[PDB]
Amino acid sequence: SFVEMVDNLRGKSGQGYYVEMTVGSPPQTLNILVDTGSSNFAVGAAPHPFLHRYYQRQLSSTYRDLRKGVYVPYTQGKWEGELGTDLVSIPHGPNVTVRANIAAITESDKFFINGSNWEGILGLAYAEIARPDDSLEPFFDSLVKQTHVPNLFSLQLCGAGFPLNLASVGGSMIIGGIDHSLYTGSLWYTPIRREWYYEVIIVRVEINGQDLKMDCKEYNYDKSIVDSGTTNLRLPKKVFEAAVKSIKAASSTEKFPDGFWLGEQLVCWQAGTTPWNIFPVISLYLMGEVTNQSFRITILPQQYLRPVEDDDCYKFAISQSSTGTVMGAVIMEGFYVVFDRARKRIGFAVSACHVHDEFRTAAVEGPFVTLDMEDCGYNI
Ligand SMILES: CC(=O)N[C@@H](Cc1cc(F)cc(F)c1)[C@H](O)CN[C@@]1(c2cccc(C(C)(C)C)c2)CCc2[nH]ncc2C1
């Protein structure tokens, strides 16, 4: 249908977006973080101070132990666990059940977040980056192989301010297709360069219409990916420095502590007086499937200035990286993103929950003629 899947995501700002899932027999309900930046399906399977509930394998008649250990280290957090298989469903997803690999998390460190409301993670990327090795079939590969669900999903991650009905921000994960009521305008597609992370190629970057003027290999230095499990826009050292230099220049009328630009300190303004006009729009051009059909996604300050609290407070959500460009949640917010795995491409369109701005508007625009995968792709 797809209507049954609209609004199936919830989350707290900066703590990921999650979807309801069931595991075992009888079905045990768990909220699971949707992560396109990994490929392991893992759930709390032991008591933890921040876990409201967890997966009890002893109470599932369909549980099968694989007699194998596993661990996954992320950017900061990590967990270890025991591999097994079990029946998995998504109540607000397709009407199907599948036997999938499940990493039963037995110990963890800085993985679970206090009061987040999620108890596990659903890695939606490819087998190549799955631990302990690529022989561990990811959930989405299992879903597609065992059912007739088409090989593609879409994510509409919404920012704050939209009606929901535990709170702040919602979204949609349409499994097996594209829901047209979730976006406006045209969907533009960029190739998945390789099936491991959802890797793409950035061919140009503009700040307030002014080209950053860098060797485009710098934009994809190491790699460039789409990652719903990461909050910030992460930029390679050199791009980060040139970008923050343009953003500081554009916003020079006001001055902020060095801590602000490092993403550690917050900045506030009397309620409703946020001076959005002095922060520029960032345009990221993605390589077209055909290079005279490239396109840009335009990000407003309402996206890269993430709202928090203690009247209107904000965190700078652009960070330095030594591991490539990561287009995180703040980038995906306000766009409808199609992970068209069947045709090895990712689509972008303006979301129905796009960010406001009285004088500017987020956009997905093209066509543009640009450089190639060969000119812009870093070869590792
Ligand atoms: C912030 C973060 O760590 N997000 C991850 C999901 C997550 C959400 C959460 F709420 C708590 C938590 F502990 C983890 C997500 O998987 C991160 N994904 C990347 C990644 C980094 C370290 C290793 C991994 C694999 C080995 C592949 C799992 C992935 C993708 C690749 C990459 N290059 N630079 C940065 C990244 C981020």
Show me where the domains of the chain are located.
Answer: 17-149, 150-380
Cβ proximity of 167 and 156 under 8 Å? no
**17-149, which class in CATH?**
mainly beta
Please indicate whether residue 233, judged by its CB atom, sits closer than 6 Å to ligand 1: no
Round to whole Å and give the CA distance between 160 and 17: 12
Helices (H) and strands (E) in the chain, counts: 6, 25
Cβ proximity of 220 and 191 under 8 Å? no
The closest alpha carbon to 30, from 40, 38, 39, 18, belongs to 18
Burial class (CB in 10 A: 0-12, 13-18, 19+), 61: exposed
| CA atoms 365, 300, 9, 63: torsion sign | positive
Cβ proximity of 92 and 82 under 8 Å? no
Residue with tokens 């703590």: 15
The DSSP secondary structure of 50-101, one letter per residue, reads T-S----GGG-TT-EEEEEEEEEE-SS-EEEEEEEEEEEE-TTS-S--EEEE
Which of 48, 74, 197 to probe ligand 1 with, by most ligand atoms within 8 A of CB?
74
For residue 311, how many other CB atoms are within 10 A of its CB?
10
Please indicate whether residue 313, judged by its CB atom, sits closer than 6 Å to ligand 1: no
Cβ proximity of 122 and 21 under 8 Å? yes
The answer to whether 17-149 and 150-380 have equal CATH topology is yes
Q: What's 2's DSSP letter?
A: -
Element spanning 301, H or E = helix 301-304
Instruction: Answer yes or no: 311 catalytic.
Output: no
Cβ proximity of 337 and 347 under 8 Å? yes
The DSSP secondary structure of 214-277, one letter per residue, reads --TTGGGSS-EEE-TT--SEEEEHHHHHHHHHHHHHHTTTS---HHHHTTSS-EEESTT---GG
Residue nearest to atom 28 of ligand 1 (CA): 38
Element spanning 34, H or E = strand 28-35
Which CATH fold would you assign to the domain 150-380? Cathepsin D, subunit A; domain 1 (2.40.70)
Instruction: Answer yes or no: 134 catalytic.
Output: no
Element spanning 204, H or E = strand 202-207
Distances (CA, A) of 250 to 158, 204, 317: 27, 19, 17
Distances (CA, A) of 260 to 203, 239, 244, 263: 28, 18, 11, 5
Which two structure tokens, joined as six digits, stand for 68?
């194998």
Round to whole Å and give the CA distance between 29 and 149: 22
Name the experiment that determined this structure: X-ray
Q: What's the N-to-C CA distance of the chain in angstroms?
A: 42
Question: What resolution in angstroms, rounded to 1 decimal?
Answer: 2.2
Distances (CA, A) of 239 to 29, 35, 233, 284, 324: 43, 25, 12, 12, 10
Which two structure tokens, joined as six digits, stand for 323?
């591991």
Strand partners, 353: none
Round to whole Å and give the CA distance between 231 and 112: 15
- SS3 state of residue 211: strand
Cβ proximity of 140 and 38 under 8 Å? no
Among 7, 35, 86, 340, the one annotated catalytic: 35
Round to whole Å and give the CA distance between 84 and 62: 10
Distances (CA, A) of 222 to 14, 39, 123, 321, 322: 25, 19, 21, 10, 8
